[PDB]
Design a protein around this nucleic acid. Structure first.
Length: 155
RNA sequence: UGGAGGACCGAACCCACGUAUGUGGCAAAAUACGGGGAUGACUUGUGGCUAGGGGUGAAAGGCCAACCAAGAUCGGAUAUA
RNA sequence: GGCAAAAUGACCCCGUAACUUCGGGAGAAGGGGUGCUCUCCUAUCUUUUGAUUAGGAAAGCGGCACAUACCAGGGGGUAGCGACUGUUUAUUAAAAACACAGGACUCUGCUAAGUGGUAACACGAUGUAUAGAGUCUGACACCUGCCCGGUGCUGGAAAGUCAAAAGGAGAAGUGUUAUAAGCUUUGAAUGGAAGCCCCGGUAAACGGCGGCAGUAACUCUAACUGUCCUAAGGUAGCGAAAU
């Protein structure tokens, strides 16, 4: 009897199930997967406090057994599918119009300038860069690779 | 039967497209006649916030007290030339 | 440069094309009618008494003229750019500029990434990958070729190469002594993470995408091949174009 909407610690949870609304620290409060209809999935139960979970990001983590979850995927699966159809919809949600790089005068974004469209060089030009010299394509992480690799190689 | 629309025509309203006027003018940016949208990414009143290598920008090097590729005013300072 | 000026305009009726995303084009275009008088019937109307006001029949009646003044769309055919409504250089540029929903890539497992500050801390967000940030393009349809050699971004192997801290052992100054003790100066074999070096990965990352020389019963050109070079040698498509 694993029934939908119910919660419990993972210690009373069986392998292969589907879950959402996990909490990272023991009882802190559900901060893991929460969005409209997105489902994690457990992978095993070694009785060492930890439980290996596969998250929607594809990657996986270990959560203490005394932590909790909610059976079944979150509600409302379509929201990730509904395509808006004008500008007013964004505006209502809260957005404002976002301006690109190659538009701004060079004084304002590293991609500026040009007499007509252009951004960077054929030798010099580094890549496409954020407003603060940080590059955004290629797999860039900016020395948070330290944190990533530490928490990974804890496996 | 219903009454949706970043729907339509058109005053309030805002905005500022063309011509002519004016060019110590009525006015240090207006007027006449025509123009565009006109339930929406709307217009507005009130009061609060962001302050100069900074703000803010549906991005023009635009705007920040009538003159911004770095405000105003004091001071270094009778700067230098 | 038909700029301006002119003209069309209203209501009712007739009828209305290409095209298509089948919602629209569309007030498409193109026409007619519009006054008042009495009568008839119709409705309607309690504002009581039966008539009055409007509509639509049908007969007059006058004017050149009957939305008579004021008010009030010029329309059609076809390219380019942009999908459009929007926004912008207050106070010479409102556009093809910007945005825009739509698309892809990259980053983030939550003390989330990213941002402001020194720093607490705040935003992110009383949000949790169908989420948030950045980047390029810009509805829709058809589609999106080749190159990772360069710049960047990135994974990774042991090798050497390592800066500093760790520092052998020499040498040297001075000390009876002519050079032991001792202090001191310099040293200086090993030490050394990243990175450098190397091998990879990336083009909806920044970027680049060629020459020659012969060759057919008309020349031509070359379907054919020989060729030099690259990392790769411009595919679909388009084309004296905003080029």
């Amino acid at each position: 009897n694993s029934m939908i909407g119910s919660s419990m610690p993972l210690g009373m949870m069986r392998i292969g199930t589907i879950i959402h609304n996990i909490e990272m620290n023991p009882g802190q409060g559900a901060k893991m997967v929460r969005a409209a209809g997105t489902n994690a999935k457990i992978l095993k139960e070694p009785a060492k406090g930890k439980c290996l979970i596969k998250l929607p990001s594809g990657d996986t983590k270990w959560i203490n057994a005394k932590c909790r979850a909610t059976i079944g995927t979150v509600s409302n699966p379509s929201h990730g599918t509904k395509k808006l159809y004008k500008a007013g919809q964004s505006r209502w949600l809260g957005i404002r119009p976002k301006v690109r790089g190659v538009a701004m005068n060079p004084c304002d974004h590293p991609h500026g300038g040009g007499e007509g469209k252009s951004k960077s060089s054929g030798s010099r030009g580094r890549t496409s860069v954020s407003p603060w010299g940080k590059p955004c394509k290629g797999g860039y992480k900016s020395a948070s690779v330290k944190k990533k690799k530490k928490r990974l190689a804890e496996a």
